[PDB]
Design an enzyme around this catalytic site. Structure first.
Site, short mmCIF file in Angstrom:
data_model
loop_
_atom_site.label_atom_id
_atom_site.label_comp_id
_atom_site.label_asym_id
_atom_site.label_seq_id
_atom_site.Cartn_x
_atom_site.Cartn_y
_atom_site.Cartn_z
N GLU A 153 -58.62 -19.29 -3.48
CA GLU A 153 -58.77 -18.89 -4.89
C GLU A 153 -57.86 -17.69 -5.18
OE1 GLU A 153 -62.71 -17.35 -5.62
OE2 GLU A 153 -62.25 -16.66 -7.65
N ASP A 199 -57.37 -14.95 -7.89
CA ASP A 199 -57.93 -14.35 -9.11
C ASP A 199 -56.80 -13.62 -9.85
OD1 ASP A 199 -60.42 -15.41 -8.67
OD2 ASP A 199 -61.02 -13.80 -7.31
N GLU A 202 -59.41 -10.66 -13.68
CA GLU A 202 -60.82 -10.33 -13.74
C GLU A 202 -60.85 -8.98 -14.42
OE1 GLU A 202 -63.57 -11.99 -10.70
OE2 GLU A 202 -61.90 -11.51 -9.27
N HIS A 206 -57.61 -14.63 -2.58
CA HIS A 206 -58.68 -14.88 -1.66
C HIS A 206 -58.28 -16.12 -0.82
CE1 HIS A 206 -62.21 -12.85 -3.82
NE2 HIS A 206 -61.26 -12.90 -4.76
#
Ligand SMILES: *[C@@H]1O[C@H](CO)[C@@H](O)[C@H](O)[C@H]1NC(C)=O
Length: 402
Positions: free
Chosen positions: A197, A199, A202, A213
Protein backbone atom coordinates in the site's frame (compact mmCIF):
# COMPACT_ATOMS: atom_id res chain seq x y z
CA UNK A 1 -21.72 -11.63 -1.92
CA UNK A 2 -24.40 -11.99 -4.98
CA UNK A 3 -25.50 -8.74 -6.66
CA UNK A 4 -29.22 -8.09 -6.17
CA UNK A 5 -31.73 -6.29 -8.35
CA UNK A 6 -31.07 -2.73 -7.24
CA UNK A 7 -28.90 -1.16 -9.91
CA UNK A 8 -25.48 0.33 -9.35
CA UNK A 9 -25.11 3.81 -10.88
CA UNK A 10 -21.45 4.90 -10.95
CA UNK A 11 -20.50 8.58 -10.87
CA UNK A 12 -18.27 9.59 -13.78
CA UNK A 13 -14.97 11.43 -13.17
CA UNK A 14 -12.72 13.08 -15.80
CA UNK A 15 -9.02 12.50 -15.05
CA UNK A 16 -5.78 13.16 -17.05
CA UNK A 17 -2.66 11.45 -18.53
CA UNK A 18 0.27 13.81 -18.96
CA UNK A 19 3.43 13.95 -21.03
CA UNK A 20 5.93 16.78 -21.44
CA UNK A 21 5.49 16.60 -25.21
CA UNK A 22 1.68 16.28 -25.07
CA UNK A 23 0.50 18.11 -21.93
CA UNK A 24 -2.43 16.75 -19.86
CA UNK A 25 -5.13 14.99 -21.97
CA UNK A 26 -8.52 14.12 -20.52
CA UNK A 27 -9.64 10.59 -19.77
CA UNK A 28 -12.98 9.21 -18.63
CA UNK A 29 -13.04 7.21 -15.42
CA UNK A 30 -15.73 6.08 -13.03
CA UNK A 31 -16.10 5.87 -9.26
CA UNK A 32 -17.06 2.87 -7.15
CA UNK A 33 -17.87 2.51 -3.45
CA UNK A 34 -16.35 -0.35 -1.47
CA UNK A 35 -18.38 -3.56 -1.66
CA UNK A 36 -18.84 -3.44 2.14
CA UNK A 37 -20.44 0.04 1.99
CA UNK A 38 -23.25 -1.52 -0.07
CA UNK A 39 -26.30 -2.88 1.66
CA UNK A 40 -25.67 -6.60 2.13
CA UNK A 41 -28.60 -8.73 3.39
CA UNK A 42 -29.65 -12.35 3.82
CA UNK A 43 -31.48 -13.97 0.91
CA UNK A 44 -35.22 -14.73 0.91
CA UNK A 45 -36.37 -17.04 3.68
CA UNK A 46 -33.18 -16.83 5.72
CA UNK A 47 -34.33 -14.60 8.58
CA UNK A 48 -33.44 -11.02 9.46
CA UNK A 49 -29.81 -9.97 9.74
CA UNK A 50 -26.77 -9.32 7.63
CA UNK A 51 -23.69 -11.25 6.64
CA UNK A 52 -21.14 -9.96 9.12
CA UNK A 53 -19.50 -6.96 10.78
CA UNK A 54 -16.09 -5.47 9.88
CA UNK A 55 -13.46 -7.40 11.89
CA UNK A 56 -15.13 -10.84 11.55
CA UNK A 57 -15.96 -13.89 9.42
CA UNK A 58 -19.48 -14.00 7.94
CA UNK A 59 -22.11 -15.60 10.22
CA UNK A 60 -21.79 -19.32 10.48
CA UNK A 61 -25.52 -20.01 10.05
CA UNK A 62 -25.74 -18.59 6.53
CA UNK A 63 -22.03 -18.90 5.56
CA UNK A 64 -20.73 -22.36 6.49
CA UNK A 65 -18.90 -22.20 3.15
CA UNK A 66 -18.19 -19.94 0.20
CA UNK A 67 -20.78 -21.46 -2.08
CA UNK A 68 -23.46 -21.08 0.57
CA UNK A 69 -22.42 -17.55 1.44
CA UNK A 70 -22.49 -16.61 -2.23
CA UNK A 71 -26.14 -17.64 -2.51
CA UNK A 72 -27.41 -16.58 0.97
CA UNK A 73 -25.96 -13.02 1.03
CA UNK A 74 -27.16 -10.31 -1.35
CA UNK A 75 -25.23 -7.21 -2.34
CA UNK A 76 -27.68 -4.49 -3.41
CA UNK A 77 -26.46 -1.98 -5.97
CA UNK A 78 -26.38 1.72 -4.94
CA UNK A 79 -28.38 3.72 -7.55
CA UNK A 80 -27.68 7.13 -5.98
CA UNK A 81 -24.13 7.74 -4.73
CA UNK A 82 -25.10 11.17 -3.28
CA UNK A 83 -26.78 9.25 -0.43
CA UNK A 84 -23.24 8.11 0.55
CA UNK A 85 -21.54 11.56 0.49
CA UNK A 86 -20.08 10.87 -2.97
CA UNK A 87 -20.61 13.27 -5.90
CA UNK A 88 -18.56 14.22 -8.95
CA UNK A 89 -18.56 17.23 -11.22
CA UNK A 90 -16.40 17.14 -14.34
CA UNK A 91 -12.94 16.69 -12.80
CA UNK A 92 -13.85 17.08 -9.14
CA UNK A 93 -14.66 14.35 -6.66
CA UNK A 94 -16.43 15.42 -3.53
CA UNK A 95 -16.53 13.24 -0.43
CA UNK A 96 -18.78 14.20 2.48
CA UNK A 97 -18.00 12.51 5.73
CA UNK A 98 -21.36 13.64 7.23
CA UNK A 99 -24.51 14.57 5.30
CA UNK A 100 -26.78 17.56 5.92
CA UNK A 101 -29.23 15.26 7.74
CA UNK A 102 -26.59 13.92 10.15
CA UNK A 103 -25.94 10.49 8.57
CA UNK A 104 -22.21 9.61 8.62
CA UNK A 105 -21.42 7.68 5.42
CA UNK A 106 -17.60 8.21 5.66
CA UNK A 107 -17.23 7.02 2.07
CA UNK A 108 -14.42 4.97 0.59
CA UNK A 109 -14.15 4.64 -3.20
CA UNK A 110 -11.90 3.25 -5.92
CA UNK A 111 -11.23 4.54 -9.44
CA UNK A 112 -12.67 2.41 -12.24
CA UNK A 113 -11.35 2.36 -15.79
CA UNK A 114 -13.48 3.64 -18.66
CA UNK A 115 -15.37 0.35 -19.11
CA UNK A 116 -16.53 0.19 -15.52
CA UNK A 117 -15.58 -3.49 -15.35
CA UNK A 118 -12.07 -3.17 -14.01
CA UNK A 119 -10.13 -0.92 -11.68
CA UNK A 120 -7.91 1.69 -13.32
CA UNK A 121 -4.37 0.29 -13.01
CA UNK A 122 -1.76 2.92 -12.16
CA UNK A 123 1.89 2.12 -12.96
CA UNK A 124 3.75 4.92 -11.19
CA UNK A 125 7.39 3.97 -10.77
CA UNK A 126 9.44 6.53 -12.70
CA UNK A 127 6.33 8.78 -13.08
CA UNK A 128 4.37 11.31 -11.03
CA UNK A 129 0.86 11.56 -9.63
CA UNK A 130 -0.82 14.90 -8.94
CA UNK A 131 -4.12 16.35 -7.71
CA UNK A 132 -5.64 19.56 -6.41
CA UNK A 133 -7.37 19.41 -3.04
CA UNK A 134 -9.42 21.63 -0.75
CA UNK A 135 -8.80 20.48 2.81
CA UNK A 136 -10.37 23.56 4.46
CA UNK A 137 -13.10 21.50 6.11
CA UNK A 138 -10.90 18.89 7.80
CA UNK A 139 -10.11 19.78 11.41
CA UNK A 140 -7.94 17.79 13.82
CA UNK A 141 -9.02 14.11 13.89
CA UNK A 142 -10.21 13.92 10.27
CA UNK A 143 -8.36 11.88 7.72
CA UNK A 144 -8.81 12.56 4.04
CA UNK A 145 -6.92 9.84 2.14
CA UNK A 146 -5.88 9.14 -1.45
CA UNK A 147 -3.76 6.09 -1.82
CA UNK A 148 -2.81 3.00 -3.71
CA UNK A 149 -3.44 -0.67 -2.82
CA UNK A 150 -2.30 -3.72 -4.85
CA UNK A 151 -5.84 -4.97 -5.44
CA UNK A 152 -6.64 -7.25 -8.36
CA UNK A 153 -7.80 -5.55 -11.57
CA UNK A 154 -11.28 -7.07 -11.83
CA UNK A 155 -11.88 -7.21 -8.08
CA UNK A 156 -11.08 -10.92 -8.35
CA UNK A 157 -14.29 -11.48 -10.26
CA UNK A 158 -14.96 -15.27 -10.28
CA UNK A 159 -17.79 -17.82 -10.15
CA UNK A 160 -18.86 -16.89 -6.57
CA UNK A 161 -18.02 -13.14 -7.05
CA UNK A 162 -19.68 -12.06 -10.28
CA UNK A 163 -19.92 -8.46 -9.01
CA UNK A 164 -16.15 -7.77 -9.19
CA UNK A 165 -14.67 -4.26 -9.36
CA UNK A 166 -18.09 -3.03 -10.59
CA UNK A 167 -19.39 -3.56 -6.99
CA UNK A 168 -16.09 -2.52 -5.35
CA UNK A 169 -14.86 -6.02 -4.39
CA UNK A 170 -11.32 -6.97 -3.56
CA UNK A 171 -10.14 -4.30 -1.09
CA UNK A 172 -6.84 -4.98 0.65
CA UNK A 173 -4.26 -2.86 2.43
CA UNK A 174 -1.24 -3.11 4.69
CA UNK A 175 -3.18 -3.62 7.93
CA UNK A 176 -4.29 -7.16 6.93
CA UNK A 177 -7.78 -6.54 8.31
CA UNK A 178 -10.48 -9.18 8.62
CA UNK A 179 -13.64 -8.38 6.67
CA UNK A 180 -16.70 -10.64 6.32
CA UNK A 181 -16.01 -10.95 2.58
CA UNK A 182 -12.61 -11.03 0.85
CA UNK A 183 -12.35 -10.73 -2.97
CA UNK A 184 -16.17 -10.83 -3.07
CA UNK A 185 -16.22 -14.27 -1.34
CA UNK A 186 -17.39 -15.14 2.21
CA UNK A 187 -14.23 -15.09 4.37
CA UNK A 188 -15.09 -18.37 6.07
CA UNK A 189 -11.76 -18.73 7.89
CA UNK A 190 -11.54 -15.07 9.01
CA UNK A 191 -8.24 -14.39 7.26
CA UNK A 192 -6.94 -10.84 6.84
CA UNK A 193 -6.76 -9.05 3.51
CA UNK A 194 -3.16 -7.98 2.91
CA UNK A 195 -1.37 -6.09 0.17
CA UNK A 196 1.33 -3.50 -0.52
CA UNK A 197 0.00 0.00 0.00
CA UNK A 198 1.36 3.43 -0.98
CA UNK A 199 -0.29 6.14 1.11
CA UNK A 200 0.09 9.09 -1.22
CA UNK A 201 -2.01 11.37 0.97
CA UNK A 202 -3.36 11.13 4.54
CA UNK A 203 -4.16 14.55 5.79
CA UNK A 204 -6.33 17.27 7.16
CA UNK A 205 -5.92 21.08 7.37
CA UNK A 206 -3.40 20.76 10.24
CA UNK A 207 -1.14 17.90 9.09
CA UNK A 208 -0.05 16.02 5.94
CA UNK A 209 1.41 12.49 5.91
CA UNK A 210 2.89 10.40 3.17
CA UNK A 211 3.80 6.71 3.66
CA UNK A 212 4.79 3.67 1.60
CA UNK A 213 3.96 0.35 3.28
CA UNK A 214 5.57 -2.81 1.95
CA UNK A 215 4.38 -6.40 2.14
CA UNK A 216 6.50 -9.42 1.24
CA UNK A 217 3.78 -10.86 -1.04
CA UNK A 218 2.56 -9.61 -4.43
CA UNK A 219 -1.12 -8.71 -4.87
CA UNK A 220 -3.80 -9.65 -2.29
CA UNK A 221 -2.52 -12.11 0.36
CA UNK A 222 -4.92 -13.94 2.75
CA UNK A 223 -3.16 -14.10 6.09
CA UNK A 224 -3.86 -16.17 9.17
CA UNK A 225 -2.60 -15.94 12.76
CA UNK A 226 0.78 -14.19 13.05
CA UNK A 227 0.96 -13.45 9.29
CA UNK A 228 -1.66 -10.74 10.00
CA UNK A 229 0.10 -9.27 13.07
CA UNK A 230 2.80 -6.66 13.64
CA UNK A 231 5.59 -9.13 12.87
CA UNK A 232 3.81 -10.58 9.80
CA UNK A 233 3.81 -10.28 6.00
CA UNK A 234 2.89 -6.58 5.87
CA UNK A 235 4.27 -3.35 7.29
CA UNK A 236 1.51 -1.76 9.37
CA UNK A 237 3.45 1.37 10.39
CA UNK A 238 4.81 2.38 6.97
CA UNK A 239 7.82 4.66 6.59
CA UNK A 240 6.06 7.87 7.70
CA UNK A 241 6.79 11.26 6.19
CA UNK A 242 5.31 14.29 8.00
CA UNK A 243 7.05 17.70 8.32
CA UNK A 244 6.18 17.85 12.07
CA UNK A 245 7.80 14.49 12.82
CA UNK A 246 11.05 15.76 11.31
CA UNK A 247 10.93 19.01 13.30
CA UNK A 248 9.77 21.50 10.62
CA UNK A 249 6.70 23.17 12.11
CA UNK A 250 5.91 26.06 9.78
CA UNK A 251 5.51 24.17 6.54
CA UNK A 252 1.84 23.15 6.43
CA UNK A 253 -1.22 24.46 8.32
CA UNK A 254 -4.08 26.97 8.40
CA UNK A 255 -2.66 30.50 8.04
CA UNK A 256 -0.29 32.75 6.11
CA UNK A 257 2.55 31.72 8.37
CA UNK A 258 2.67 28.21 6.79
CA UNK A 259 4.34 27.62 3.39
CA UNK A 260 1.30 25.53 2.33
CA UNK A 261 -1.75 27.40 3.60
CA UNK A 262 -4.61 24.94 4.09
CA UNK A 263 -7.13 27.77 4.32
CA UNK A 264 -6.97 27.78 0.46
CA UNK A 265 -6.82 25.08 -2.23
CA UNK A 266 -3.51 23.70 -3.40
CA UNK A 267 -1.82 21.19 -5.68
CA UNK A 268 -0.09 18.05 -4.38
CA UNK A 269 2.68 16.47 -6.49
CA UNK A 270 4.20 13.05 -5.80
CA UNK A 271 7.14 11.69 -7.85
CA UNK A 272 8.28 8.06 -7.76
CA UNK A 273 11.90 8.52 -8.75
CA UNK A 274 13.92 5.52 -10.13
CA UNK A 275 17.63 4.53 -11.26
CA UNK A 276 18.24 3.69 -14.94
CA UNK A 277 17.43 0.15 -14.35
CA UNK A 278 13.88 1.17 -13.21
CA UNK A 279 13.90 0.39 -9.50
CA UNK A 280 12.33 2.98 -7.14
CA UNK A 281 14.86 4.87 -5.08
CA UNK A 282 13.21 8.08 -3.87
CA UNK A 283 9.70 9.34 -3.22
CA UNK A 284 9.45 13.14 -3.58
CA UNK A 285 6.60 15.26 -2.32
CA UNK A 286 6.07 18.94 -3.19
CA UNK A 287 3.21 21.45 -3.50
CA UNK A 288 2.01 24.23 -5.78
CA UNK A 289 -0.05 27.09 -4.36
CA UNK A 290 -0.89 30.51 -5.75
CA UNK A 291 1.24 29.96 -8.85
CA UNK A 292 4.38 28.95 -6.92
CA UNK A 293 6.10 25.60 -6.45
CA UNK A 294 6.61 24.85 -2.77
CA UNK A 295 9.62 22.55 -2.61
CA UNK A 296 9.72 19.84 -0.03
CA UNK A 297 11.08 20.73 3.39
CA UNK A 298 14.36 19.12 4.51
CA UNK A 299 14.45 16.94 7.67
CA UNK A 300 15.58 19.03 10.67
CA UNK A 301 16.02 16.41 13.32
CA UNK A 302 18.92 15.05 15.31
CA UNK A 303 19.62 11.40 14.40
CA UNK A 304 17.65 11.75 11.13
CA UNK A 305 19.75 11.88 7.93
CA UNK A 306 19.49 15.20 6.25
CA UNK A 307 17.16 14.71 3.29
CA UNK A 308 14.25 16.26 1.35
CA UNK A 309 12.92 12.93 0.05
CA UNK A 310 11.77 9.56 1.27
CA UNK A 311 14.39 6.85 0.83
CA UNK A 312 15.78 3.68 2.43
CA UNK A 313 18.29 5.42 4.71
CA UNK A 314 15.60 7.83 5.97
CA UNK A 315 13.14 4.97 6.56
CA UNK A 316 15.66 2.81 8.36
CA UNK A 317 16.96 5.66 10.51
CA UNK A 318 13.43 6.58 11.53
CA UNK A 319 12.77 3.03 12.79
CA UNK A 320 10.74 1.65 9.81
CA UNK A 321 12.00 -1.91 10.45
CA UNK A 322 9.14 -3.85 8.83
CA UNK A 323 9.17 -1.52 5.84
CA UNK A 324 12.78 -2.40 5.08
CA UNK A 325 12.48 -6.10 5.86
CA UNK A 326 9.43 -6.70 3.69
CA UNK A 327 10.98 -5.25 0.51
CA UNK A 328 12.08 -1.67 1.33
CA UNK A 329 11.67 1.11 -1.30
CA UNK A 330 12.65 -1.12 -4.17
CA UNK A 331 9.84 -3.49 -3.07
CA UNK A 332 7.33 -0.64 -2.84
CA UNK A 333 8.38 0.32 -6.36
CA UNK A 334 7.91 -3.21 -7.77
CA UNK A 335 4.23 -3.12 -6.59
CA UNK A 336 3.89 0.34 -8.23
CA UNK A 337 5.36 -1.19 -11.47
CA UNK A 338 3.02 -4.24 -11.30
CA UNK A 339 0.12 -1.76 -11.12
CA UNK A 340 -2.01 -0.44 -8.29
CA UNK A 341 -5.57 0.66 -7.68
CA UNK A 342 -6.53 4.16 -6.57
CA UNK A 343 -8.56 4.53 -3.39
CA UNK A 344 -9.96 7.76 -1.88
CA UNK A 345 -11.67 8.09 1.49
CA UNK A 346 -12.57 10.31 4.44
CA UNK A 347 -12.94 9.06 8.01
CA UNK A 348 -12.48 9.70 11.73
CA UNK A 349 -11.17 7.48 14.56
CA UNK A 350 -13.32 7.19 17.74
CA UNK A 351 -10.69 5.07 19.49
CA UNK A 352 -7.46 6.98 18.85
CA UNK A 353 -8.59 10.35 17.49
CA UNK A 354 -6.13 10.04 14.56
CA UNK A 355 -3.37 11.15 16.95
CA UNK A 356 -0.63 9.63 14.78
CA UNK A 357 -1.77 11.93 11.97
CA UNK A 358 -1.73 15.34 13.64
CA UNK A 359 -0.97 15.23 17.37
CA UNK A 360 2.14 15.32 19.59
CA UNK A 361 5.14 14.74 17.33
CA UNK A 362 2.85 14.58 14.29
CA UNK A 363 1.32 18.07 14.65
CA UNK A 364 -0.47 20.85 16.46
CA UNK A 365 -3.68 19.16 17.60
CA UNK A 366 -4.09 18.88 21.39
CA UNK A 367 -5.06 15.71 23.26
CA UNK A 368 -8.81 14.99 22.75
CA UNK A 369 -9.12 17.59 19.97
CA UNK A 370 -9.56 14.88 17.38
CA UNK A 371 -12.38 13.05 19.11
CA UNK A 372 -15.42 12.85 16.82
CA UNK A 373 -17.51 14.78 19.41
CA UNK A 374 -15.03 17.63 19.29
CA UNK A 375 -14.60 17.40 15.52
CA UNK A 376 -18.23 18.18 14.91
CA UNK A 377 -18.01 21.35 17.14
CA UNK A 378 -15.19 22.65 14.95
CA UNK A 379 -16.75 21.45 11.66
CA UNK A 380 -20.19 19.90 11.71
CA UNK A 381 -19.90 18.69 8.06
CA UNK A 382 -16.31 17.64 7.32
CA UNK A 383 -15.60 17.02 3.66
CA UNK A 384 -12.84 16.92 1.06
CA UNK A 385 -12.69 17.64 -2.66
CA UNK A 386 -10.09 16.11 -4.98
CA UNK A 387 -9.80 17.70 -8.44
CA UNK A 388 -7.93 17.18 -11.70
CA UNK A 389 -6.47 13.69 -10.88
CA UNK A 390 -3.49 13.56 -13.29
CA UNK A 391 -0.43 11.41 -13.82
CA UNK A 392 2.39 10.70 -16.18
CA UNK A 393 5.84 11.98 -16.95
CA UNK A 394 8.05 13.70 -14.39
CA UNK A 395 7.69 17.45 -14.84
CA UNK A 396 4.37 17.46 -16.76
CA UNK A 397 1.37 17.57 -14.32
CA UNK A 398 1.90 21.00 -12.81
CA UNK A 399 2.86 24.54 -13.69
CA UNK A 400 4.46 27.55 -12.01
CA UNK A 401 3.72 31.22 -12.63
CA UNK A 402 6.30 34.02 -12.90
C1 LIG B 1 14.26 21.20 16.15
O1 LIG B 1 14.40 22.44 15.42
C2 LIG B 1 14.88 23.54 16.17
C3 LIG B 1 14.97 24.74 15.24
O2 LIG B 1 15.76 24.54 14.11
C4 LIG B 1 16.26 23.14 16.72
O3 LIG B 1 16.80 24.21 17.50
C5 LIG B 1 16.18 21.85 17.58
O4 LIG B 1 17.51 21.49 17.93
C6 LIG B 1 15.60 20.76 16.71
N1 LIG B 1 15.46 19.53 17.51
C7 LIG B 1 16.13 18.38 17.32
C8 LIG B 1 15.83 17.31 18.30
O5 LIG B 1 16.85 18.30 16.44
Amino acid sequence: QKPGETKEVHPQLTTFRCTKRGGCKPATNFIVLDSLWHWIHRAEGLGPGGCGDWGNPPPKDVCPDVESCAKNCIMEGIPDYSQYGVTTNGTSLRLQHILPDGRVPSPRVYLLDKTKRRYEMLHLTGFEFTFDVDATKLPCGMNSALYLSEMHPTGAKSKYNPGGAYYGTGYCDAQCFVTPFINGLGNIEGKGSCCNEMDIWEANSRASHVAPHTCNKKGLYLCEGEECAFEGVCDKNGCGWNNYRVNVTDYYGRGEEFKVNTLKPFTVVTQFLANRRGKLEKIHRFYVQDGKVIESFYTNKEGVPYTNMIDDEFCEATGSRKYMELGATQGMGEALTRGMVLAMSIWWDQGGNMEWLDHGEAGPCAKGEGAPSNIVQVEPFPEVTYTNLRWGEIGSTYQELQ
